[PDB]
Amino acid sequence: VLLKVIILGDSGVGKTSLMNQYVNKKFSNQYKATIGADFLTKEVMVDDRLVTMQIWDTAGLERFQSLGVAFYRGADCCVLVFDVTAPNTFKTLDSWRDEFLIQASPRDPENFPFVVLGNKIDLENRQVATKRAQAWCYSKNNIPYFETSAKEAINVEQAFQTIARNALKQE
Amino acid sequence: KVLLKVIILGDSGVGKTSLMNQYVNKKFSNQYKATIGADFLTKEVMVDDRLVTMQIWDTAGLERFQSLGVAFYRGADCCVLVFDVTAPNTFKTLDSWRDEFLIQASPRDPENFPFVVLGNKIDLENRQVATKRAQAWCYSKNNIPYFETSAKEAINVEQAFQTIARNALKQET
Amino acid sequence: IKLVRKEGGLDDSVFIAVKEIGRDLYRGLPTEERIQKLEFMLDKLQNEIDQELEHNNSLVREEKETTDTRKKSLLSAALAKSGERLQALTLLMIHYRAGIEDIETL
Ligand SMILES: Nc1nc2c(ncn2[C@@H]2O[C@H](COP(=O)(O)OP(=O)(O)OP(=O)(O)O)[C@@H](O)[C@H]2O)c(=O)[nH]1
Ligand SMILES: Nc1nc2c(ncn2[C@@H]2O[C@H](COP(=O)(O)OP(=O)(O)OP(=O)(O)O)[C@@H](O)[C@H]2O)c(=O)[nH]1
Ligand SMILES: [Mg+2]
Ligand SMILES: [Mg+2]
């Protein structure tokens, strides 16, 4: 029983930092752009059983994307990340979610498992408010919403525990 | 400063690693050090007046099981096909190496993509693949150049890679 | 930004394969020398990625600022080829990373 989770969202929002904080318990300040994709593996406990979670990090920058359509068809759960200090990254969430649904073409697209992370809450002068993001998540079939900091490991463990539960729904 | 990416292909043991090391490092190992580990070396070369950077990729290892050409061949400007003139079976597989590259790299104009064929180990003074034979195969493959080489004695090594550089440069923007 | 659709893009199997093979990279060498050679390769690969990524960014800046359609079309093809080289280099780095991860699971 293997769970395939993919992380999507604009470049710079913290997709790689969130994956590395959850699996490796480490965080780095310096930016290394993700080219193409990579995955890490983690055993996670759901209910009292170990399932293997395969967490796919992907390129936010369009010119560095290389994954084919067949790849997205096997995703069990899709994580949407934005930056609470960068409202354009919240604005584009619709196009990430919709384009993924077109390529994944799940059998019941409107109940596909998404989880949304609002990252970098450790920064001052956040420009997207919690209720505003919550309103959006509610409107999209009430998908779970976590506010996270990869830099300070706020809600990282809690978010991925929900991601794993949602991925099992599909599987 | 133009960068030229060169893939070297061919059966285990023909001298791929040794041809790269002899061109780039001017060193040869008599010892058989089989390629564990894809790697590339870099060398500045002058092509008629232009100074260009050549990256020479040595991706193949013990057995072909690796689909790793899908990962590593992309972006190449030239592909070097190497066989051992003392082992006719290494010449027999050239078609499959050339086709492998064309399928897994998907170059923009497959029929004009620069290939170069090196028949290696002429110093072993045992020639089981005749010079005319390799040239006939090469001619039929859209007229690609053929060089007989020795990585051990540095025979034709500098000459082969100068032509590799030129032909890699020729098909670009 | 958006999710590019690429009909023959990469599949699971390529990443799984580079990791499976990479796990045994330089197996045979002493546990001392093995981790030496792997660190050397990851450092060399990062420097090469950095270099290429700086050339890539320079091509991006210049394509944004060009009005001449001919020179834009040439910049786009160079940027595409830079992108392909970066994909290969990144998959090579992932290959050697699996060697490191093999040492530290042991
Ligand atoms: N302050 C703060 N910085 C973060 C946080 N998460 C990531 N960063 C930093 O933000 C920058 C971008 O982070 P990445 O994880 O590389 O972003 P990415 O989403 O993977 O970007 P791409 O690979 O281009 O798609 C890096 O410099 C990180 O150090 C966070 O929660 N708080
Ligand atoms: N006599 C002679 N021996 C050579 C020559 N070139 C390579 N060799 C020897 O042939 C053997 C194979 O050399 P490699 O360079 O590792 O061959 P390779 O094509 O990279 O293939 P793998 O070893 O399987 O990775 C080694 O013992 C070399 O010393 C040559 O030009 N003349
Ligand atoms: Mg990233
Ligand atoms: Mg070799």
- Residue A61 with chain C: CB contacts under 8 Å: 1
- Rounded CA separation A117/A98 (Å): 17
Can you list the alpha helix ranges (DSSP code H) found in C1-106? Answer: 12-22, 31-65, 69-105
- Rounded CA separation B56/B54 (Å): 6
From C73, which residue of chain B is nearest by alpha-carbon distance?
B173
- Residue C95 with chain B: CB contacts under 8 Å: 38, 68, 71
- Compute the half-sphere exposure of residue A146: CA atoms within 13 Å on the CB side of its CA: 21
CA-proximal residue: ligand 1, atom 8 (nearest): A14
Burial class (CB in 10 A: 0-12, 13-18, 19+), A59: buried
Range of the domain at B171: 1-173
- Rounded CA separation B64/B43 (Å): 27
- Rounded CA separation A59/A108 (Å): 26
Contacts 24+ apart (CB under 8 A), A20-24: A20/A150, A21/A150, A21/A153, A21/A156, A22/A55, A22/A156, A22/A157, A22/A159, A22/A160, A23/A55
Range of the domain at C19: 15-105
Burial class (CB in 10 A: 0-12, 13-18, 19+), B81: buried
Taking the CA atoms of A153, A154, A159 and A161 in sequence, report the sign of the dihedral they define.
positive
Looking at the structure of chain B, the number of domains it has is 1
Cα R_g (chain A), whole angstroms: 15
Q: Best mutation site among B11, B18, B41 for ligand 2, i.e. most ligand atoms within 8 A of its Cβ?
A: B18
Residue A64 CB neighbours (<10 A): 21
Q: Is residue C5 part of a domain?
A: no
3-state secondary structure of A171: coil
Contact C5 A102 (CB under 8 A): yes
- Rounded CA separation A152/A146 (Å): 14
Closest CA to B86 of B34, B12, B14, B11: B14
Structure tokens at C48: 């090469």
- Residue B5 with chain C: CB contacts under 8 Å: 85
Residue B148: phi and psi, rounded to 5, are -90, 130
Q: Is residue C92 part of a domain?
A: yes
Strand pairing of B50-58 and B39-47?
antiparallel
- Rounded CA separation C80/A56 (Å): 24
* Angstrom resolution of this structure: 2.1
Structure tokens at B152: 């051990």
- Rounded CA separation B17/B13 (Å): 9
Q: Is residue C4 part of a domain?
A: no
Query: In this complex, which chains have at least 3 CB pairs below 8 Å with chain B?
Result: C
- Rounded CA separation A87/B155 (Å): 63
N-terminal to C-terminal alpha carbon distance within chain A: 8
Asked how this structure was determined, the answer is X-ray
Instruction: Please provide the DSSP assignment of B103-161 as one string.
Output: HHH--SSGGG--EEEEEE-GGG---SS-HHHHHHHHHHTTS--EEEEBTTTTBSHHHHH
Residue C32 CB neighbours (<10 A): 7
Strand pairing of A37-46 and A49-58?
antiparallel
Q: DSSP state, A67?
A: B
Looking at the structure of chain C, the number of domains it has is 1
CA distances (Å), origin C40, targets A32, B28, C43, C44, C68: 19, 22, 5, 6, 43
- Rounded CA separation B161/B167 (Å): 10
CA distance to partner chain C, nearest, from residue B61 (Å): 11
Contact B3 C18 (CB under 8 A): no
Could you identify the residue written with the tokens 């030496």?
Answer: C36
Q: Is residue C39 part of a domain?
A: yes
To the nearest 10°, report the CA torsion of A56, A123, C60, A10. Answer: 40
CA distances (Å), origin B74, targets A59, B7, B68, C62, C104: 18, 10, 11, 24, 31
Closest CA to A155 of A59, A81, A53: A81
Residue C25 CB neighbours (<10 A): 23
Q: Is residue C32 part of a domain?
A: yes
Cβ atoms of A7 and A26 within 8 Å: the answer is no
Closest CA to B53 of B170, B168, B171: B168
Q: Is residue C36 part of a domain?
A: yes
Q: Any idea which ligand is nearest the CA of B87?
A: 2
- Rounded CA separation B80/B97 (Å): 10
**Counting one residue from B and one from C, how many pairs have CB atoms under 8 Å apart?**
51
Residues 58-77 on B with a CB inside 8 Å of C are 66-68, 70-75
To the nearest 10°, report the CA torsion of B126, B130, B135, B138. Answer: -70
Which amino acid, one-letter code, is at B62?
A: L
Q: Is residue C72 part of a domain?
A: yes
- Rounded CA separation B38/C90 (Å): 13
Q: Pick from C10, C55, C88: which is nearest to B75 by CB?
A: C88
- Residue C89 with chain A: CB contacts under 8 Å: 35
H or E element, residue A29: none
- Compute the half-sphere exposure of residue B116: CA atoms within 13 Å on the CB side of its CA: 23
Contact B71 C27 (CB under 8 A): no
H or E element, residue C10: none
